[PDB]
């Protein structure tokens, strides 16, 4: 298992009159497409976003999707009519359609629909299906949608043949951007702890790509098991930020270092020592009144 292709649809229905549908498309952690509600054409976000599809091939898809968006918006507007007291506005729908690409010819396809935040329906095989725990009233809308044999065929075509084919080409086309290596840049900081005479040590790691990194607090070869990794936050330039903390007692800072391991470094692990020549000099440049 390596790259997951995701086409994300976000449709908001405020009432009978107001609606809007916006999409984003993700090949791993990189967005390839963007489709605003105001844009009548799918916009490329990378130079290799068309993949290995011809202009006529791509145009046939874009037109397919163009037609679909207006059809989907009305079909929901109609299902609210039909589902009268069981459900009503404001309505929120999410769609996740794509491929998980594995070595060789191996691929698994998916189409998942979330209603009002919860995942309730999936397209499975040749039909729409509710998933465990879905509201009972979804049975009629499914029975109604599964009546359409054209959509089923169109969808089966995409998930089974088009999506894997597309994304296989997408992978060759974007190889230079997908296989990139960006070196992280680390810097230390510190703040008081909840407890008296206790400090929290922050080790900031930023600008690395791909996502897998190792950030630990050390005291020689001794990995400080107290280290609490933060959650990967993105940067605007399609890179990553992460910070590792350690709770110490005042004076236990001397000897501690922050060790960063990453693919871009090439075995040359960043060792950042608390109180190092650089730490002192970097700290002077980042002073404020709190």
């Amino acid at each position, epitope marked *: 298992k390596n790259y997951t292709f995701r086409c994300l649809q976000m449709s908001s229905f405020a009432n009978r009159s107001w609606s809007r549908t916006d999409s984003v498309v993700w090949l791993g952690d990189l967005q390839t497409h963007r489709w605003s509600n105001d844009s009548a054409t799918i916009s490329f976000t990378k130079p290799w976003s068309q993949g290995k599809l011809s202009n006529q091939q791509w145009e046939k898809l874009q037109h397919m999707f163009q*037609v679909y968006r207006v*059809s989907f918006t*009305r*079909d929901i507007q*109609e*299902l609210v*009519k*039909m589902m*009268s007291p069981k459900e009503d506005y404001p309505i929120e729908i999410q769609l996740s359609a794509g491929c998980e690409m594995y070595p060789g010819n191996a691929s698994e396809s998916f189409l998942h629909v979330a209603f009002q935040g919860k995942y309730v329906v999936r397209f499975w095989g040749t039909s729409w299906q509710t998933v465990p725990g879905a509201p009972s009233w979804l049975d*009629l809308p499914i*029975k*109604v*949608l599964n*009546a*359409d*044999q*054209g*959509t089923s065929a169109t969808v089966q075509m995409l998930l089974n043949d088009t999506c894997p084919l597309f994304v296989r080409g997408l992978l060759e086309a974007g190889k230079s951007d997908l296989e990139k290596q960006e070196k992280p840049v680390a810097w230390l900081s510190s703040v008081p702890s909840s407890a008296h005479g206790h400090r929290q040590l922050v080790c900031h790691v930023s600008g690395f790509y791909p996502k897998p990194v190792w950030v630990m607090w050390m005291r020689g070869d001794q990995e400080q098991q107290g280290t609490h990794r933060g959650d990967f936050l993105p940067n605007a330039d399609e890179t990553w930020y992460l910070q590792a903390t350690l709770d110490v007692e005042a004076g236990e800072e001397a000897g501690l270092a922050c060790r960063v391991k990453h693919s871009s470094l090439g075995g040359q692990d960043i060792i950042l020592y608390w109180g190092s020549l650089h730490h002192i000099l970097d700290a002077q440049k980042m002073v404020w009144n709190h």
Partner: T-cell receptor
Amino acid sequence: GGIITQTPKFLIGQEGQKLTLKCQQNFNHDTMYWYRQDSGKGLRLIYYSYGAGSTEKGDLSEGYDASREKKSSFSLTVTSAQKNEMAVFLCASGSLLDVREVFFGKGTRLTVVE
Amino acid sequence: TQVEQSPQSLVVRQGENSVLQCNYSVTPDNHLRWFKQDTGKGLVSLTVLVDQKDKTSNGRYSATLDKDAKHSTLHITATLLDDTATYICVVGDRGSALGRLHFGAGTQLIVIP
């Protein structure tokens, strides 16, 4: 399966008179429609319904209202009759699980008099 | 108007063939169907066309559909006098019951004995 029947066959109304026309189907169709046929024009939808208590506006929804009392019956009401107009109203019923199963009524003929 | 039938009126000698047609701009174009409306009565289905290139035939009525050319022809073989009526062409824009029908103005057919 059965029949979709409109009532009355013919209708006489005076300028401003509020006329109503009933339609009963035994097909066991959830969807019901009220259309208006004008000479040199296609059928235009006035109102439609997914079952009891549901009345959804068509395109020619102005000057009319519908009332779906039960699955079997749909009822159109002309809010006020026009000066000396002549009109045809057509009732249709449809399967909620088969878009292609549509059955039509034999039409109601309206004549407004002075 | 999105559905247009041709010609407005058609005259055919009894025992001959009748060819009435309809072109459309409705999108999506799930299915096309023809009705016969007898003078002062309701609408009666003759045929339903569903495929990209479909041909269907009910009794003496036959029909075709080129969903690419967005065109459909109605064929009345051996025109009887009982065929004197308006022929209405309808397009359904969806496969589920969430769709809406689009109706042509009709072609009035007159069969000279």
